mmCIF file of all heavy atoms in Angstrom:
data_model
loop_
_atom_site.group_PDB
_atom_site.id
_atom_site.type_symbol
_atom_site.label_atom_id
_atom_site.label_comp_id
_atom_site.label_asym_id
_atom_site.label_seq_id
_atom_site.Cartn_x
_atom_site.Cartn_y
_atom_site.Cartn_z
ATOM 1 N N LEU A 1 31.352 167.639 114.203
ATOM 2 C CA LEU A 1 32.492 166.909 113.667
ATOM 3 C C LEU A 1 33.603 166.901 114.705
ATOM 4 O O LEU A 1 33.991 167.959 115.210
ATOM 5 C CB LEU A 1 32.986 167.549 112.368
ATOM 6 C CG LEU A 1 34.285 167.007 111.769
ATOM 7 C CD1 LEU A 1 34.172 165.518 111.487
ATOM 8 C CD2 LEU A 1 34.646 167.771 110.505
ATOM 9 N N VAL A 2 34.109 165.712 115.021
ATOM 10 C CA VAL A 2 35.168 165.536 116.008
ATOM 11 C C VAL A 2 36.405 165.001 115.302
ATOM 12 O O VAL A 2 36.330 164.004 114.574
ATOM 13 C CB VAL A 2 34.734 164.590 117.141
ATOM 14 C CG1 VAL A 2 35.918 164.217 118.009
ATOM 15 C CG2 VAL A 2 33.667 165.259 117.997
ATOM 16 N N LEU A 3 37.536 165.668 115.520
ATOM 17 C CA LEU A 3 38.825 165.246 114.978
ATOM 18 C C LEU A 3 39.703 164.775 116.135
ATOM 19 O O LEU A 3 40.230 165.588 116.905
ATOM 20 C CB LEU A 3 39.490 166.376 114.192
ATOM 21 C CG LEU A 3 38.664 166.976 113.055
ATOM 22 C CD1 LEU A 3 39.428 168.100 112.372
ATOM 23 C CD2 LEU A 3 38.294 165.884 112.060
ATOM 24 N N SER A 4 39.857 163.459 116.248
ATOM 25 C CA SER A 4 40.661 162.836 117.293
ATOM 26 C C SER A 4 41.941 162.307 116.644
ATOM 27 O O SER A 4 42.027 161.134 116.269
ATOM 28 C CB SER A 4 39.882 161.735 117.987
ATOM 29 O OG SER A 4 38.725 162.251 118.620
ATOM 30 N N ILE A 5 42.933 163.188 116.516
ATOM 31 C CA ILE A 5 44.216 162.877 115.898
ATOM 32 C C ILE A 5 45.372 163.112 116.867
ATOM 33 O O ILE A 5 46.195 162.222 117.092
ATOM 34 C CB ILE A 5 44.419 163.679 114.590
ATOM 35 C CG1 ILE A 5 43.447 163.205 113.501
ATOM 36 C CG2 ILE A 5 45.870 163.597 114.131
ATOM 37 C CD1 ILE A 5 42.015 163.635 113.675
ATOM 38 N N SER A 6 45.456 164.311 117.443
ATOM 39 C CA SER A 6 46.413 164.532 118.519
ATOM 40 C C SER A 6 46.042 163.707 119.744
ATOM 41 O O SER A 6 46.922 163.228 120.469
ATOM 42 C CB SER A 6 46.471 166.014 118.880
ATOM 43 O OG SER A 6 46.858 166.789 117.761
ATOM 44 N N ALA A 7 44.742 163.540 119.993
ATOM 45 C CA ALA A 7 44.247 162.790 121.140
ATOM 46 C C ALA A 7 42.836 162.312 120.832
ATOM 47 O O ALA A 7 42.257 162.642 119.793
ATOM 48 C CB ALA A 7 44.267 163.635 122.416
ATOM 49 N N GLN A 8 42.289 161.519 121.748
ATOM 50 C CA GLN A 8 40.907 161.059 121.657
ATOM 51 C C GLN A 8 40.018 162.069 122.373
ATOM 52 O O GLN A 8 40.184 162.312 123.575
ATOM 53 C CB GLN A 8 40.752 159.666 122.267
ATOM 54 C CG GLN A 8 39.337 159.104 122.204
ATOM 55 C CD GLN A 8 38.801 158.998 120.793
ATOM 56 O OE1 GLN A 8 39.391 158.330 119.943
ATOM 57 N NE2 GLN A 8 37.674 159.659 120.535
ATOM 58 N N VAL A 9 39.083 162.661 121.637
ATOM 59 C CA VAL A 9 38.201 163.688 122.187
ATOM 60 C C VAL A 9 37.109 163.027 123.022
ATOM 61 O O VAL A 9 36.362 162.185 122.502
ATOM 62 C CB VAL A 9 37.591 164.553 121.069
ATOM 63 C CG1 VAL A 9 36.697 165.632 121.665
ATOM 64 C CG2 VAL A 9 38.693 165.164 120.211
ATOM 65 N N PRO A 10 36.979 163.364 124.308
ATOM 66 C CA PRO A 10 35.909 162.765 125.122
ATOM 67 C C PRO A 10 34.541 163.223 124.642
ATOM 68 O O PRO A 10 34.265 164.424 124.576
ATOM 69 C CB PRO A 10 36.206 163.279 126.539
ATOM 70 C CG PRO A 10 37.623 163.738 126.505
ATOM 71 C CD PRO A 10 37.847 164.241 125.114
ATOM 72 N N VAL A 11 33.674 162.259 124.324
ATOM 73 C CA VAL A 11 32.331 162.607 123.870
ATOM 74 C C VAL A 11 31.608 163.421 124.933
ATOM 75 O O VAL A 11 30.776 164.281 124.613
ATOM 76 C CB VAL A 11 31.550 161.333 123.492
ATOM 77 C CG1 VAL A 11 30.079 161.654 123.263
ATOM 78 C CG2 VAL A 11 32.152 160.698 122.243
ATOM 79 N N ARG A 12 31.915 163.177 126.209
ATOM 80 C CA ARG A 12 31.274 163.935 127.277
ATOM 81 C C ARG A 12 31.569 165.425 127.153
ATOM 82 O O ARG A 12 30.699 166.261 127.426
ATOM 83 C CB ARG A 12 31.738 163.414 128.639
ATOM 84 C CG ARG A 12 33.230 163.610 128.912
ATOM 85 C CD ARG A 12 33.661 162.907 130.199
ATOM 86 N NE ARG A 12 35.071 163.139 130.518
ATOM 87 C CZ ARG A 12 36.052 162.250 130.353
ATOM 88 N NH1 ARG A 12 35.804 161.038 129.866
ATOM 89 N NH2 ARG A 12 37.294 162.579 130.683
ATOM 90 N N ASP A 13 32.792 165.776 126.743
ATOM 91 C CA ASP A 13 33.147 167.186 126.591
ATOM 92 C C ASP A 13 32.414 167.833 125.424
ATOM 93 O O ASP A 13 32.072 169.019 125.491
ATOM 94 C CB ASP A 13 34.657 167.330 126.417
ATOM 95 C CG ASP A 13 35.426 166.926 127.657
ATOM 96 O OD1 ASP A 13 34.789 166.744 128.720
ATOM 97 O OD2 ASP A 13 36.666 166.788 127.571
ATOM 98 N N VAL A 14 32.172 167.082 124.349
ATOM 99 C CA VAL A 14 31.446 167.633 123.210
ATOM 100 C C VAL A 14 30.021 167.992 123.616
ATOM 101 O O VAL A 14 29.588 169.145 123.497
ATOM 102 C CB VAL A 14 31.451 166.631 122.042
ATOM 103 C CG1 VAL A 14 30.621 167.155 120.874
ATOM 104 C CG2 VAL A 14 32.877 166.342 121.595
ATOM 105 N N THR A 15 29.274 167.001 124.113
ATOM 106 C CA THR A 15 27.869 167.221 124.443
ATOM 107 C C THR A 15 27.685 168.276 125.525
ATOM 108 O O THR A 15 26.698 169.018 125.497
ATOM 109 C CB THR A 15 27.227 165.903 124.866
ATOM 110 O OG1 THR A 15 27.929 165.368 125.994
ATOM 111 C CG2 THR A 15 27.266 164.908 123.707
ATOM 112 N N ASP A 16 28.611 168.368 126.482
ATOM 113 C CA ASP A 16 28.476 169.389 127.516
ATOM 114 C C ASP A 16 28.512 170.788 126.914
ATOM 115 O O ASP A 16 27.784 171.682 127.359
ATOM 116 C CB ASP A 16 29.574 169.232 128.567
ATOM 117 C CG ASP A 16 29.394 167.988 129.416
ATOM 118 O OD1 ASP A 16 28.275 167.426 129.426
ATOM 119 O OD2 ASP A 16 30.371 167.579 130.080
ATOM 120 N N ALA A 17 29.355 170.999 125.902
ATOM 121 C CA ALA A 17 29.395 172.295 125.235
ATOM 122 C C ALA A 17 28.314 172.409 124.168
ATOM 123 O O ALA A 17 27.832 173.513 123.895
ATOM 124 C CB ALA A 17 30.770 172.530 124.611
ATOM 125 N N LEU A 18 27.917 171.286 123.570
ATOM 126 C CA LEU A 18 26.927 171.260 122.493
ATOM 127 C C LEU A 18 25.945 170.148 122.830
ATOM 128 O O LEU A 18 26.144 168.987 122.445
ATOM 129 C CB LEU A 18 27.586 171.034 121.136
ATOM 130 C CG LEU A 18 26.651 171.063 119.926
ATOM 131 C CD1 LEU A 18 25.966 172.419 119.797
ATOM 132 C CD2 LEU A 18 27.414 170.727 118.650
ATOM 133 N N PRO A 19 24.853 170.474 123.520
ATOM 134 C CA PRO A 19 23.890 169.437 123.915
ATOM 135 C C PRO A 19 23.267 168.730 122.724
ATOM 136 O O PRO A 19 22.920 169.350 121.716
ATOM 137 C CB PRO A 19 22.838 170.216 124.716
ATOM 138 C CG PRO A 19 23.550 171.445 125.187
ATOM 139 C CD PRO A 19 24.527 171.789 124.106
ATOM 140 N N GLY A 20 23.126 167.415 122.854
ATOM 141 C CA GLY A 20 22.465 166.628 121.830
ATOM 142 C C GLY A 20 23.228 166.522 120.532
ATOM 143 O O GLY A 20 22.616 166.308 119.479
ATOM 144 N N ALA A 21 24.551 166.650 120.577
ATOM 145 C CA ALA A 21 25.348 166.659 119.357
ATOM 146 C C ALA A 21 25.320 165.290 118.685
ATOM 147 O O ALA A 21 25.560 164.264 119.328
ATOM 148 C CB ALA A 21 26.787 167.064 119.671
ATOM 149 N N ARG A 22 25.013 165.281 117.392
ATOM 150 C CA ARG A 22 25.119 164.076 116.567
ATOM 151 C C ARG A 22 26.562 164.008 116.079
ATOM 152 O O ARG A 22 26.951 164.719 115.148
ATOM 153 C CB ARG A 22 24.129 164.133 115.412
ATOM 154 C CG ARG A 22 22.696 164.372 115.862
ATOM 155 C CD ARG A 22 21.684 164.120 114.748
ATOM 156 N NE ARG A 22 21.743 165.150 113.712
ATOM 157 C CZ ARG A 22 22.130 164.942 112.452
ATOM 158 N NH1 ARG A 22 22.476 163.730 112.031
ATOM 159 N NH2 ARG A 22 22.144 165.957 111.600
ATOM 160 N N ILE A 23 27.360 163.147 116.703
ATOM 161 C CA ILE A 23 28.813 163.188 116.562
ATOM 162 C C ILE A 23 29.264 162.305 115.403
ATOM 163 O O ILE A 23 29.149 161.080 115.451
ATOM 164 C CB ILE A 23 29.515 162.780 117.867
ATOM 165 C CG1 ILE A 23 29.273 163.849 118.936
ATOM 166 C CG2 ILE A 23 30.994 162.530 117.618
ATOM 167 C CD1 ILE A 23 29.820 163.509 120.303
ATOM 168 N N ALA A 24 29.790 162.939 114.364
ATOM 169 C CA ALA A 24 30.663 162.284 113.408
ATOM 170 C C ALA A 24 32.097 162.474 113.891
ATOM 171 O O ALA A 24 32.436 163.504 114.478
ATOM 172 C CB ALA A 24 30.492 162.875 112.011
ATOM 173 N N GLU A 25 32.942 161.469 113.654
ATOM 174 C CA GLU A 25 34.307 161.514 114.163
ATOM 175 C C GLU A 25 35.280 161.028 113.105
ATOM 176 O O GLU A 25 35.028 160.031 112.427
ATOM 177 C CB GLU A 25 34.444 160.667 115.437
ATOM 178 C CG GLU A 25 35.858 160.603 116.000
ATOM 179 C CD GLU A 25 35.906 159.971 117.382
ATOM 180 O OE1 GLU A 25 35.037 159.118 117.681
ATOM 181 O OE2 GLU A 25 36.806 160.333 118.169
ATOM 182 N N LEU A 26 36.392 161.748 112.970
ATOM 183 C CA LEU A 26 37.531 161.320 112.170
ATOM 184 C C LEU A 26 38.716 161.139 113.107
ATOM 185 O O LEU A 26 39.015 162.029 113.913
ATOM 186 C CB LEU A 26 37.871 162.335 111.079
ATOM 187 C CG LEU A 26 38.948 161.874 110.090
ATOM 188 C CD1 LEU A 26 38.433 160.707 109.253
ATOM 189 C CD2 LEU A 26 39.419 163.020 109.207
ATOM 190 N N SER A 27 39.392 159.997 113.000
ATOM 191 C CA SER A 27 40.471 159.668 113.915
ATOM 192 C C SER A 27 41.475 158.777 113.208
ATOM 193 O O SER A 27 41.237 158.296 112.096
ATOM 194 C CB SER A 27 39.936 158.965 115.163
ATOM 195 O OG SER A 27 39.274 157.760 114.800
ATOM 196 N N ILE A 28 42.612 158.574 113.859
ATOM 197 C CA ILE A 28 43.606 157.601 113.412
ATOM 198 C C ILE A 28 43.717 156.526 114.483
ATOM 199 O O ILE A 28 43.299 156.728 115.638
ATOM 200 C CB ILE A 28 44.970 158.264 113.120
ATOM 201 C CG1 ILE A 28 45.516 158.951 114.371
ATOM 202 C CG2 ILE A 28 44.810 159.267 111.985
ATOM 203 C CD1 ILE A 28 46.954 159.411 114.228
ATOM 204 N N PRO A 29 44.283 155.366 114.139
ATOM 205 C CA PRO A 29 44.391 154.285 115.139
ATOM 206 C C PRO A 29 45.087 154.694 116.433
ATOM 207 O O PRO A 29 44.588 154.384 117.520
ATOM 208 C CB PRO A 29 45.173 153.202 114.380
ATOM 209 C CG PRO A 29 44.912 153.483 112.934
ATOM 210 C CD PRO A 29 44.797 154.967 112.818
ATOM 211 N N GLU A 30 46.228 155.384 116.349
ATOM 212 C CA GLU A 30 47.014 155.763 117.522
ATOM 213 C C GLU A 30 47.184 157.278 117.561
ATOM 214 O O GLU A 30 48.207 157.816 117.101
ATOM 215 C CB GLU A 30 48.384 155.078 117.519
ATOM 216 C CG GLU A 30 48.329 153.568 117.537
ATOM 217 C CD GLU A 30 49.697 152.951 117.707
ATOM 218 O OE1 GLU A 30 50.461 152.910 116.716
ATOM 219 O OE2 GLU A 30 50.016 152.523 118.838
ATOM 220 N N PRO A 31 46.214 157.996 118.114
ATOM 221 C CA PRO A 31 46.349 159.452 118.240
ATOM 222 C C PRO A 31 47.661 159.844 118.903
ATOM 223 O O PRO A 31 48.074 159.259 119.905
ATOM 224 C CB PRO A 31 45.142 159.844 119.100
ATOM 225 C CG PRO A 31 44.129 158.790 118.807
ATOM 226 C CD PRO A 31 44.899 157.516 118.576
ATOM 227 N N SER A 32 48.335 160.827 118.313
ATOM 228 C CA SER A 32 49.627 161.281 118.797
ATOM 229 C C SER A 32 49.810 162.746 118.438
ATOM 230 O O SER A 32 49.346 163.202 117.390
ATOM 231 C CB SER A 32 50.770 160.445 118.192
ATOM 232 O OG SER A 32 52.044 161.016 118.464
#
């Protein structure tokens, strides 16, 4: 689970720490 609210989380950073991650994401239009 990725929460991109303060910023947009780079998918590359997720998979590097968690290989093969099936990414669900919650975000807002303008992360701040």
Side-chain angles (χ1 to χ4, degrees):
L1 173 58
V2 169
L3 304 179
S4 298
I5 292 74
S6 300
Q8 180 59 58
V9 181
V11 170
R12 64 188 183 255
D13 294 348
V14 176
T15 59
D16 290 343
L18 183 61
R22 306 193 289 114
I23 292 175
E25 177 170 29
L26 187 67
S27 60
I28 60 170
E30 300 187 283
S32 170

